[PDB]
Design a protein around this ligand. Structure first.
Ligand SMILES: [Zn+2]
Ligand SMILES: [Zn+2]
Ligand SMILES: [Zn+2]
Ligand SMILES: [Zn+2]
Ligand SMILES: [Zn+2]
Lengths: 494, 511
């Protein structure tokens, strides 16, 4: 199949050099000297691409383009014209032209435009596969050398970068190399975390920023600037890769000012960690200082329901005085509502939204066949997350906040990981990091265990049932890059 | 805030004409004659766009581009070079270059490239907003004038066209105008179908292609070509808008040869319409000719267990002797399986896949909050459907079929509609009921006291069909409030709407 071009120009006879040039390159050119005839051909026959002049005696190129797009939407159209006027440029681009070449045109420019517009997917696939072939041994080397938390953050960035670059490619060998680097990364990370995690809670220890330090050290400073109100959005259970999947959408409305990967405390679960975000305290200290608010595992009723109170208390412990409002969205109507009425809180200095939809979505894969098919692989989950965010009540809230000139601070409590391997909440033996003293961590317990790598805890009784139902499900609470290294972002409104 | 360009060329001093030209147009140009300097600037300072020569002393443009993309991913890079070599072109494009301009360059070409790469989202939004302002009153007019099935197909095309276009608009006012055009369109369509549907089943009558003649009239011709094996996918419950939302994905692998909007029989439900596709017969005739296969509503069990048998019979009635196999995917593993092992089907002349995921998904809005938030509005459902298809086992099957040089025929049994308004009824589905004696709001439905006339079977000789119009859902008065609260804003099918009844038939040739 030679690629079939329809070329429409009143002065087509003058373009025979260009046509000859293209035909020699296995391009088939049908020509036409008016838009009406071209539309007729464009309907009868199936062309791969159309070239259009702007100024023609009858219908203009842009008019011809309109009639053509109505009839067969997804055929790429290129404009080749003398018009150098900005307003025609703008009308072409506004019409979703694929490219606009000003005459007299270098014939190779046209060829470049054919390659870019018809071949770019496979070319990008080729170049990306070869780029990774040349890069991946450096990545194995770098991983071996990491022994710092600052260095763990860098390496995760690299893996995330290449994850999205390769997500499209179809070369099994290189896909598996990347999987194996990601597995090895977690195995190394788990050893790292168990080796220095306890040491981190000792006085004078060089330490990553964690859950219990988050509000104190990264939120307070941006408030005390005192230029603009701050919208704080804690999106529950958001992996770094999911942030990355919708970074371009959000950037239409917000410009990233500051980005800081941080380390969520163990366990990587809402009640233990999200409460810590709002309290400025480790679990143990929340039990000590607020026994009427803190809830222990064995307690029924549900968790994370006094975050507002934890937060208000922290603000005064710091000594800061501000107007503060806190909300927790747990369903559609909820978030839809808070979008329509976001107006009212302008005068409020800080606004805090907790959004639980992504956790609900991650957990839904466990039970619903539908979600299994929507989130079969990580790529699919990132894709689905993007479909979500683009049409979320959460984006509406974000869109309102910019119109009010709020600075946005966007973060999460922890991520989630696809669990693959059983070991006898499903993440909290070399398979586990034991802490037979809890105060050493700052965890409460009378008189904690954290799964590493891909592991999920399956009880000896009903071991098979646990294995078969929870295999290849998103769980959290343990130690993985995906769970524990999580974004903290400040943005300025556009 | 001027747009800041970083321009890297060993011969940058030679390019001052171009710089002056751009600076006059409120572009700020920082220049550099080496990749290493350029990388330094690119880190210190924040640029909007980068221009790059290919052949420089020291670091190459493409090497410079790679260091730059690693650091700040979404900044567009444009190559302006003397190199006309195809392999550099290919490397540049593969490296995700945003354009490649061959020197000597017309300075306006650069400007065009700046506009295309920096302004295009705004420009498309402006053009679309203004073009709909100018077009929408023509659409109201056209809808008033619609007097035929061929004319209903054209109008639906226009609504669909504009509905996807006004996704990249952010203007409620015009979005509401288009909703109200779609409501009005359905109202009109319902009355149209009520008025002509029975006439269609009379001898000689000018008629759209429907469910029962689909395979005979549009699939058989492709088979008798005998030039390629055919993969025949029936994606259950696929609205035209959803097809349109993934038309560009499929086109990477398949080139559309033929497209034919067609009219699903009433009721617009799997049990009637899909079986009709495979049988070549209206429901009544399937009762007559195949009583061991056909089922009425009242009977327990699935209502499409026997499609393979219906299909094999049709194939021999037409006197084709074909190697043909049928599969019915009802879950992930199912579809995953058929993808990994599709190659076994090489020898087949015809392969038929039925894929039920979209129906399951549409119905899941009823049940799951998560799907409610994912498919809150049509746009969201289209978006979700695209996320689905892009990562579906079904695309894997399609991808295999291309590698084996199959012709693809893609279609559906019927669409679904978001129901908003309750309509009371006494006596299974929510857009159609069947029963000996029924009471119901007359205007809201299309009643047929004599089913056989429209090729549907009667149970008793009082048994009658009703089909809900517009966005109605038939709600029992027993527990009326609970039906209203649970089924409001849910995807239902079986009745009369553009979304339900007008559905695509697509033939494609492999790339
Ligand atoms: Zn001309
Ligand atoms: Zn959480
Ligand atoms: Zn959870
Ligand atoms: Zn040079
Ligand atoms: Zn259904």
């Amino acid at each position: 199949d030679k690629i079939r071009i329809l070329w429409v120009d009143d002065e087509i006879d003058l373009l025979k050099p260009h046509i000859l040039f293209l035909e020699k390159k296995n391009y088939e050119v049908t020509t036409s000297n008016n838009g009406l005839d071209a539309i007729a051909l464009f309907e009868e026959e199936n062309f791969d691409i159309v070239f259009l002049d702007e100024n023609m005696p009858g219908m203009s190129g842009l008019e011809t383009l309109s009639e053509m797009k109505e009839k067969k939407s997804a055929i790429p159209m290129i404009m080749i014209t003398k018009s150098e006027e900005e307003y025609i440029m703008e009308e072409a681009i506004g019409s979703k032209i694929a490219d606009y070449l000003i005459k007299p045109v270098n014939p190779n420019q046209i060829l470049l435009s054919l390659k870019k517009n018809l071949d770019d997917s496979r070319l990008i696939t080729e170049k990306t596969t070869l780029d990774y072939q040349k890069e991946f041994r450096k990545i194995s080397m770098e991983l071996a050398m990491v022994n710092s938390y600052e260095d763990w953050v860098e390496l995760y960035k690299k893996l995330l970068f290449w994850e999205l670059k390769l997500e499209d490619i179809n070369d099994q060998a290189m896909i598996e190399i990347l999987e194996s680097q990601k597995v090895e990364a977690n195995s190394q990370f788990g050893k790292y975390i168990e080796r220095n995690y306890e040491d981190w809670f000792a006085p004078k220890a060089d330490k990553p920023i964690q859950s219990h330090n988050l509000f104190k050290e990264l939120v307070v400073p941006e408030i005390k600037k005192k230029d603009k109100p701050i919208l704080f959005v804690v999106i529950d259970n958001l992996r770094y890769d999911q942030w990355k999947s919708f970074e371009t959408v959000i950037s239409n409305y917000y410009k990233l000012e500051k980005e800081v990967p941080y380390f969520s405390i163990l366990p990587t679960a809402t009640q233990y960690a999200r409460n810590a975000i709002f309290s400025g305290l480790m679990p143990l200290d929340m039990e000590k200082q607020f026994p009427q608010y803190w809830k222990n595992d064995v307690e029924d009723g549900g968790k994370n329901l006094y975050e507002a109170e934890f937060l208000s208390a922290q603000i005064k412990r710091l000594g800061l005085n501000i107007k503060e409002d806190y909300f927790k969205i747990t369903n559609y109507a909820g978030g839809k509502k808070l979008a329509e009425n976001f107006k009212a809180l302008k005068g409020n200095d800080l606004v805090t939204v907790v959004y639980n939809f992504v956790d609900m979505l991650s957990h839904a894969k466990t039970e619903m066949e539908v979600v299994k098919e929507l989130a079969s692989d990580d790529k699919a989950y990132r894709s689905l997350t993007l479909s979500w965010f683009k049409n979320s009540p959460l984006l509406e809230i974000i869109q309102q906040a910019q119109l009010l000139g709020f600075k946005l601070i966007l973060t999460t409590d922890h991520g989630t990981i696809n669990v693959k391997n059983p070991s006898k909440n499903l993440r909290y033996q070399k398979d586990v990091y034991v802490v037979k003293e809890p105060k050493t961590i700052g965890l409460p317990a009378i008189n904690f265990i954290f799964a590493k790598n891909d592991f999920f805890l399956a009880y000896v009784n009903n071991y098979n049932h646990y294995v078969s139902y929870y295999k290849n499900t998103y769980q959290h609470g343990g130690i993985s890059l995906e769970e524990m290294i999580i974004p903290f972002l400040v943005f300025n409104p556009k």
